[PDB]
């Protein structure tokens, strides 16, 4: 709580070609579990989590036919924005969608999401009320008055309160084990010369999942700038992070790292040891 479900769609128009590349990617509780990609040999929705092999062949056929429709919804919407911003079809353009629902700890719908970006900037988003819109540009006003005109908000409201919550619920029962899974970080601190006689101590956390993790250094007390790096996939489903610090030579046994990760039964404490 909040358990959640999103679909992240992307349509990149391709100059010359008749229509665009479209990618849909579904997430439950932030893990990818389904995915459609239009330039695949046979383009279909596919599972991206073992516990989606559960679903039947009618599911995939029906979701695949949705992608095909979305694909065209984007092809159109692309052509239309081209007009709004006075663009040509000689250059590629990108239209993106985030949508779905969060469930509060009481399991009822907490928030709905339906938002768009053009060229990677906010364009139009459905407000939390699920009735109105916020528009970034003048250009989005054209689309806004269109969607106010056509009563677009309600129909998306229905998805968000219905199918989103229905199916999130069913996906959460199906994946329970897998979605609660956590791998613990295996940590070590390494020693690197840097200056003279100042040195770098770097605490690594390796092989963890999910990616949410906190590394902190400590000099008896509590940390002045330690460099850290943005959490990084290892490529095997686990993640990596490090936090380094600048330390005086010899005077570095006083220096402690802590790794906070939900899969850890206890936060780890490390320090350098030759």
């Amino acid at each position: 709580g909040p358990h959640s479900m999103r679909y992240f769609e992307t349509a990149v128009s391709r100059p010359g070609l008749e229509e665009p590349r479209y990618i849909s990617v579904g997430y439950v509780d932030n893990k990818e579990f389904v995915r459609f990609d239009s330039d695949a040999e046979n383009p279909r929705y596919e599972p991206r989590a073992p516990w989606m092999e559960q679903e039947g062949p009618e599911y995939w056929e029906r979701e695949t036919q949705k992608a095909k429709g979305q694909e065209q919804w984007f092809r159109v919407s692309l052509r239309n924005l081209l007009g709004y911003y006075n663009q040509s079809a000689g250059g590629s353009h990108t239209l993106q969608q985030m949508s779905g629902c969060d469930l509060g700890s009481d399991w009822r719908l907490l928030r709905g999401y339906l938002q768009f970006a053009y060229e990677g900037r906010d364009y139009i988003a459905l407000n939390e009320d699920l009735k109105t819109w916020t528009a970034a540009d003048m250009a989005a006003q054209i689309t806004r008055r269109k969607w106010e005109q056509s009563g677009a908000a309600e129909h998306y409201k229905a998805y968000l309160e219905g199918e989103c919550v229905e199916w999130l619920h069913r996906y959460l029962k199906n994946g329970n084990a897998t979605l609660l899974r956590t791998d613990s970080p295996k940590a070590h601190v390494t020693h690197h010369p840097r200056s003279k006689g100042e040195v770098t101590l770097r605490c690594w956390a390796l092989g963890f999942y999910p990616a949410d993790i906190t590394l902190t250094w400590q000099l008896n007390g509590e940390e002045q700038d330690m460099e850290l790096v943005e959490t990084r996939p290892a490529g095997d489903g686990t993640f990596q992070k490090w936090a380094s610090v600048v330390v005086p030579l010899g005077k570095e046994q006083n220096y402690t790292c802590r790794v906070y990760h939900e899969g850890l039964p206890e936060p780890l404490t490390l320090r350098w040891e030759p």
Partner: peptide, 9 residues
């Protein structure tokens, strides 16, 4: 299951 959009832009 994914959404399907209504009025285009």
């Amino acid at each position: 299951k994914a959404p399907y959009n209504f009025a285009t832009m």
